[PDB]
């Protein structure tokens, strides 16, 4: 049904605003809410259908220290929607300890979109992860806003944090948003920084302006998985049957994302189904092998042929998946979206569970290890200390990561009929 | 022909995906009637903004079963009418068998509403991390992927190759002969072939054992272990005699494929 969006920090607060502005440029409307004349599809998944013809989308802002806000705030696209959601430092503990005492309110402003909708299905998460003002405070209200409500589902858009060296309280505040996002949230689709400032590099030659290239990126990737929802399709058209086929575990919720063609500034089905499954497609960077993939594809395509193309692609046998209960690569197939114009048509995106990212996971608690360790970098602070005296939830996050590093790599065994 | 394919083969969502959460959301002669029965119809049809066209009307709705009631039967009738000059095209020989498969689509989507049952049911006991839990979850999770799997299957071949062949099959008597064709390789995809029928007949064999596997939500893990155990015995069952069926069909060769992919 109706699904409410989040939207917090600076990163997070760009990427929902270019994800809006992209919807407002693929459909068929105007920067006011004013519908074209040339429109049809399902257009209540994200837009309120509001009062005067406006399709107002429905988006929780939320922001500390407004900067990127006015910017935002002085544009044709905040006549496309100002639901007045607009509520007033740089660390996980004084962003957990500013959205402590203004949880009410900014409730109060969940409320209001909750009881204005008719109808509920989930909450997505735009949160940076130890983006500064994002840490700390969407930790707080993820913890928040699952407690509240069990009844939906929570996506919430992550990115890796380490540009490979900076700021050393860095990994101690993805550490702890990584507790939360494993206990705290039902799926997550991760992002590398480094994997997609590689590819920015690598078709472009751009590496300044890295975080406006990566918001069309990202606004790309999530129109792509919503389009099966947005436009008449007939599976997963509901973001819990999306969900469902791709968790065996419920703590295997770690989403890996490729895209076909790499640069965007007749080929057939099995190509391109090949060329996703390759990682050097995927944008995001002892054995690693995927438990379940599921694919998307948009475009120009000869619907006949995609059996053969199954077979093909069988026979070719390129991953060997899984040992215990049997899964699979899941193809589904979509119409390239009408109503704006359609550059490289071909185009497809995967959703992927794999193991892959306990490697990341183990970089990132390596640089914690030596940080631990070394015992100068994690910069004592009355905040840190009020919030633990014995910053034992540090411990708690290393045991739960542990756990999931240990239940990555005995899914990765034959034997995980055993628990571990 | 596109406005019956949406209401009798339901290609577009939001449509299905009300009727039946609606009619599932109730558990009979109380349901029968025609205040509930006649107003469900009316109430999906304005969520998928089918409505208001000239063809959300010639829609009649009924059933041909009255239960009073494991139960994988589900009954339900929806016609589509036409008049005279276009009675002799489609014929009422050809409705009849719409409603047929109509039958045999819908009871592949009490699945999916089971599913989601019992994984809502686990939704309030998810607090624990217990042996109990995760071993559990771990078959419906196991038992959802067979249905995700062969819903794929009838959504590929009753859909996308069959209406491909529908949209140059039509040319005034090889009007009547294309339709009588598209209507031929949807029962001939369906496995409905007295041929493929004991492949249909373990499929009865999996609805039942997840239909059971709803009632049970913790009660006691080895019940529903049982039950695991006979489903993957039975889908290693199923994958043997599909096999000996296409060594001895053309669709049914992407059901070999669709059911072993990187396992055996």
Same mark, same amino acid.
């Given at each position: 049904?109706?699904?409410?969006?989040?939207?917090?920090?600076?990163?997070?607060?760009?990427?929902?605003?270019?994800?809006?502005?992209?919807?407002?440029?693929?459909?068929?409307?105007?920067?006011?809410?004013?519908?074209?004349?040339?429109?049809?599809?399902?257009?209540?998944?994200?837009?309120?259908?509001?009062?005067?013809?406006?399709?107002?989308?429905?988006?929780?802002?939320?922001?500390?220290?407004?900067?990127?806000?006015?910017?935002?705030?002085?544009?044709?696209?905040?006549?496309?929607?100002?639901?007045?959601?607009?509520?007033?430092?740089?660390?996980?503990?004084?962003?957990?300890?500013?959205?402590?005492?203004?949880?009410?309110?900014?409730?109060?402003?969940?409320?209001?979109?909750?009881?204005?909708?008719?109808?509920? #299905?989930?909450?997505?998460?735009?949160?940076?992860?130890?983006?500064?003002?994002?840490?700390?405070?969407?930790?707080?209200?993820?913890?928040?806003?699952?407690?509240?409500?069990?009844?939906?589902?929570?996506?919430?858009?992550?990115?890796?944090?380490?540009?490979?060296?900076?700021?050393?309280?860095?990994?101690?505040?993805?550490?702890?948003?990584?507790?939360?996002?494993?206990?705290?949230?039902?799926?997550?689709?991760?992002?590398?920084?480094?994997?997609?400032?590689?590819?920015?590099?690598?078709?472009?030659?751009?590496?300044?302006?890295?975080?406006?290239?990566?918001?069309?990126?990202?606004?790309?990737?999530?129109?792509?998985?919503?389009?099966?929802?947005?436009?008449?399709?007939?599976?997963?058209?509901?973001?819990?049957?999306?969900?469902?086929?791709?968790?065996?575990?419920?703590?295997?919720?770690?989403?890996?994302?490729?895209?076909?063609?790499?640069?965007?500034?007749?080929?057939?089905?099995?190509?391109?189904?090949?060329?996703?499954?390759?990682?050097?497609?995927?944008?995001?960077?002892?054995?690693?092998?995927?438990?379940?993939?599921?694919?998307?594809?948009?475009?120009?395509?000869?619907?006949?042929?995609?059996?053969?193309? /199954?077979?093909?692609?069988? #026979?070719?046998?390129?991953?060997?998946?899984?040992?215990?209960?049997?899964?699979?690569?899941?193809?589904? /197939?979509?119409?390239?979206?009408?109503?704006?114009?359609?550059?490289?048509?071909?185009?497809?995106?995967?959703?992927?569970?794999?193991?892959?990212?306990?490697?990341?996971?183990?970089?990132?608690?390596?640089?914690?290890?030596?940080?631990?360790?070394?015992?100068?970098?994690?910069?004592?602070?009355?905040?840190?200390?009020?919030?633990?005296?014995?910053?034992?939830?540090?411990?708690?996050?290393?045991?739960?990561?542990?756990?999931?590093?240990?239940?990555?790599?005995?899914?990765?065994?034959?034997?995980?009929?055993?628990?571990? | 022909?596109?406005?019956?394919?949406?209401?009798?083969?339901?290609?577009?969502?939001?449509?299905?995906?009300?009727?039946?959460?609606?009619?599932?959301?109730?558990?009979?002669?109380?349901?029968?009637?025609?205040?509930?029965?006649?107003?469900?119809?009316?109430?999906?049809?304005?969520?998928?903004?089918?409505?208001?066209?000239?063809?959300?009307?010639?829609?009649?709705?009924?059933?041909?079963?009255?239960?009073?009631?494991?139960?994988?039967?589900?009954?339900?009738? !929806?016609?589509?009418?036409?008049?005279?000059?276009?009675?002799?095209?489609?014929?009422?020989?050809?409705?009849?068998?719409?409603?047929?498969?109509?039958?045999?689509?819908?009871?592949?989507?009490?699945?999916?509403?089971?599913?989601?049952?019992?994984?809502?049911?686990?939704?309030?006991?998810?607090?624990?991390?217990?042996?109990?839990?995760?071993?559990?979850?771990?078959?419906?999770?196991?038992?959802?992927?067979?249905?995700?799997?062969?819903?794929?299957?009838?959504?590929?071949?009753?859909?996308?190759?069959?209406?491909?062949?529908?949209?140059?099959?039509?040319?005034?008597?090889?009007?009547?002969?294309?339709?009588?064709?598209?209507?031929?390789?949807?029962?001939?995809?369906?496995?409905?072939?007295?041929?493929?029928?004991?492949?249909?007949?373990?499929?009865?064999?999996?609805?039942?054992?997840?239909?059971?596997?709803?009632?049970? !939500?913790?009660?006691?893990?080895?019940?529903?272990?049982?039950?695991?155990?006979?489903?993957?015995?039975?889908?290693?069952?199923?994958?043997?005699?599909?096999?000996?069926?296409?060594?001895?069909?053309?669709?049914?060769?992407?059901?070999?494929?669709?059911?072993?992919?990187?396992?055996?």
């Amino acid at each position: 049904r109706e699904i409410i969006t989040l939207q917090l920090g600076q990163c997070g607060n760009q990427i929902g605003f270019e994800f809006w502005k992209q919807l407002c440029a693929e459909h068929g409307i105007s920067p006011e809410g004013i519908v074209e004349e040339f429109a049809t599809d399902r257009k209540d998944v994200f837009f309120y259908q509001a009062d005067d013809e406006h399709y107002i989308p429905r988006a929780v802002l939320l922001d500390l220290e407004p900067r990127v806000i006015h910017s935002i705030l002085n544009s044709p696209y905040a006549k496309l929607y100002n639901p007045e959601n607009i509520y007033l430092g740089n660390n996980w503990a004084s962003g957990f300890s500013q959205g402590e005492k203004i949880h009410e309110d900014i409730f109060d402003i969940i409320d209001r979109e909750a009881d204005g909708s008719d109808s509920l #299905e989930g909450f997505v998460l735009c949160h940076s992860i130890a983006g500064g003002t994002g840490s700390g405070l969407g930790s707080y209200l993820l913890e928040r806003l699952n407690d509240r409500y069990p009844k939906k589902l929570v996506q919430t858009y992550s990115v890796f944090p380490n540009q490979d060296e900076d700021v050393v309280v860095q990994p101690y505040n993805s550490l702890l948003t990584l507790k939360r996002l494993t206990q705290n949230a039902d799926c997550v689709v991760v992002l590398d920084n480094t994997a997609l400032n590689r590819i920015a590099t690598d078709r472009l030659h751009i590496q300044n302006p890295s975080f406006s290239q990566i918001n069309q990126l990202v606004s790309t990737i999530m129109s792509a998985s919503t389009t099966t929802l947005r436009y008449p399709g007939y599976m997963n058209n509901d973001l819990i049957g999306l969900i469902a086929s791709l968790i065996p575990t419920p703590r295997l919720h770690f989403l890996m994302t490729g895209y076909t063609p790499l640069t965007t500034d007749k080929t057939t089905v099995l190509d391109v189904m090949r060329r996703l499954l390759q990682p050097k497609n995927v944008m995001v960077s002892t054995n690693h092998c995927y438990i379940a993939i599921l694919n998307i594809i948009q475009g120009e395509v000869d619907p006949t042929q995609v059996h053969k193309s /199954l077979q093909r692609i069988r #026979e070719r046998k390129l991953a060997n998946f899984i040992p215990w209960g049997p899964a699979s690569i899941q193809v589904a /197939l979509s119409r390239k979206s009408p109503y704006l114009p359609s550059a490289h048509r071909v185009s497809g995106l995967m959703m992927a569970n794999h193991t892959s990212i306990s490697s990341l996971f183990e970089r990132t608690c390596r640089q914690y290890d030596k940080l631990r360790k070394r015992e100068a970098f994690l910069e004592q602070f009355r905040k840190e200390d009020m919030f633990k005296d014995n910053f034992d939830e540090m411990d708690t996050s290393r045991e739960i990561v542990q756990q999931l590093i240990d239940e990555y790599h005995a899914a990765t065994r034959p034997d995980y009929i055993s628990w571990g | 022909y596109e406005a019956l394919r949406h209401f009798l083969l339901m290609e577009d969502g939001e449509f299905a995906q009300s009727l039946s959460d609606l009619l599932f959301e109730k558990l009979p002669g109380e349901l029968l009637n025609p205040l509930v029965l006649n107003s469900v119809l009316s109430k999906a049809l304005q969520c998928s903004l089918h409505g208001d066209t000239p063809h959300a009307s010639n829609l009649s709705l009924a059933l041909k079963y009255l239960p009073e009631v494991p139960d994988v039967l589900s009954c339900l009738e !929806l016609r589509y009418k036409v008049d005279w000059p276009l009675n002799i095209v489609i014929t009422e020989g050809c409705v009849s068998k719409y409603s047929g498969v109509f039958s045999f689509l819908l009871q592949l989507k009490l699945m999916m509403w089971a599913l989601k049952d019992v994984c809502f049911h686990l939704k309030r006991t998810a607090m624990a991390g217990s042996v109990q839990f995760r071993q559990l979850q771990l078959f419906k999770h196991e038992m959802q992927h067979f249905v995700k799997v062969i819903q794929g299957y009838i959504a590929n071949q009753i859909l996308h190759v069959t209406w491909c062949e529908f949209r140059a099959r039509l040319a005034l008597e090889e009007i009547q002969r294309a339709h009588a064709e598209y209507l031929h390789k949807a029962v001939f995809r369906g496995l409905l072939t007295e041929k493929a029928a004991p492949v249909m007949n373990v499929i009865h064999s999996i609805f039942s054992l997840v239909l059971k596997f709803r009632s049970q !939500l913790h009660p006691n893990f080895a019940l529903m272990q049982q039950s695991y155990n006979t489903f993957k015995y039975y889908s290693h069952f199923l994958f043997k005699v599909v096999t000996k069926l296409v060594n001895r069909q053309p669709h049914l060769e992407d059901f070999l494929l669709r059911i072993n992919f990187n396992n055996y």
